[PDB]
Design a protein around this ligand. Structure first.
Ligand SMILES: [Br-]
Ligand SMILES: [Zn+2]
Length: 324
């Protein structure tokens, strides 16, 4: 077959029948910058709800694999690491979700962003769902753009847990997040807290503060979405050990030295396109976050996902992770 394997040696060292089963939501973020999170030194509370969640760990020194969704998302789930990663061949490689699925962890991917950028392609199509349209997402009529919202991806998840009751499960929610350039469209009116707001496509012609304000209002909506994802997990914490991982795919330039948007090649790109937020929450000490200021990259995601399910694989031994 065409697949290039990397973890045929992978084994789950404790089974869900020998301990509490585990239920994890991985929010795959979009366009959020580390330096616009107050936990990392920003001067506005852009994540006020997460700031009040007990057990929410922040990671202040995370760098993305790349500067675009197409480059970063496959690398986030890769075994190869940023040094060997090749965007053009990523789809042929066994990735961490392929491994976990083979080992019996339920894999679900809901997408309100674009698609999985090849990550889900080898797995059954019934495990991938497009949440960008109102035919699948029930929450698209809350704004004048008729734009489907990330919180719609929480609806019906209890069916998945019930269908896989007693097993380990990993649910990816690929959110619209801070996708630009129309940051002002990314949030409903209750999050229009920082004003005034850039509403034009020529971002350089907006007042800089108005551009920042639109971007930060979109972060408030993501704060809300992540908090609601934690609320959902808590409804299952009697029977499951639950956890939420959030990592953004890349950052965004907002006019520094006249640069806007993202996508600059890694060798040239400014720090704002690479420094990304990451958060981890869990309900108890089954999982323990790594020290908040540990220097980490997207290479830490695959080892984190394996460790969350007690899976060992030689390819990622000694790699740092977001949990101990
Ligand atoms: Br302010
Ligand atoms: Zn992106």
């Amino acid at each position: 077959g065409p697949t290039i394997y990397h973890a045929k040696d992978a084994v789950q060292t404790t089974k869900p029948s020998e301990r509490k089963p585990r239920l994890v939501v991985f929010v795959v973020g979009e366009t959020a910058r580390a330096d616009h999170v107050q936990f990392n030194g920003y001067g506005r509370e852009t994540f006020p709800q997460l700031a009040k969640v007990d057990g929410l760990a922040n990671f202040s020194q995370v760098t993305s694999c790349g500067t675009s969704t197409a480059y970063s998302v496959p690398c986030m789930f890769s075994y190869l690491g940023q040094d060997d990663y090749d965007v053009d061949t990523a789809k042929y490689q066994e990735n961490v979700l392929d491994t976990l699925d083979r080992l019996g962890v339920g894999i679900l991917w809901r997408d309100n962003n674009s698609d999985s950028k090849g990550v889900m392609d080898k797995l059954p199509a019934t495990q991938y769902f497009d949440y960008k349209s109102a035919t699948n997402n029930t929450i698209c009529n809350t704004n004048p753009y008729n734009e489907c919202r990330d919180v719609g991806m929480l609806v019906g998840l209890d069916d998945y847990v019930s269908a896989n009751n007693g097993k380990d499960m990993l649910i990816m929610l690929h959110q619209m997040g801070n996708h630009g350039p129309a940051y002002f469209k990314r949030y409903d009116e209750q999050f229009a807290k920082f004003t005034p707001v850039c509403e034009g496509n020529e971002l350089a012609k907006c007042e800089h503060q108005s551009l920042i304000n639109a971007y930060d209002n979109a972060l408030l909506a993501t704060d809300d979405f992540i908090a609601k994802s934690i609320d959902w997990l808590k409804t299952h914490e009697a029977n499951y050990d639950v956890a939420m991982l959030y990592v953004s795919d890349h950052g965004e330039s907002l006019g520094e030295n006249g640069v806007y948007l993202h996508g600059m090649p890694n060798a040239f790109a400014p720090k704002e396109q690479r420094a990304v937020p990451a958060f981890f929450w869990s309900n108890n000490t089954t999982f323990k976050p790594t020290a908040s200021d540990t220097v980490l990259t997207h290479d830490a995601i695959t080892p984190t996902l394996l460790k969350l399910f007690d899976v060992t694989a030689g390819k990622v031994k000694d790699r740092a992770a977001f949990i101990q």
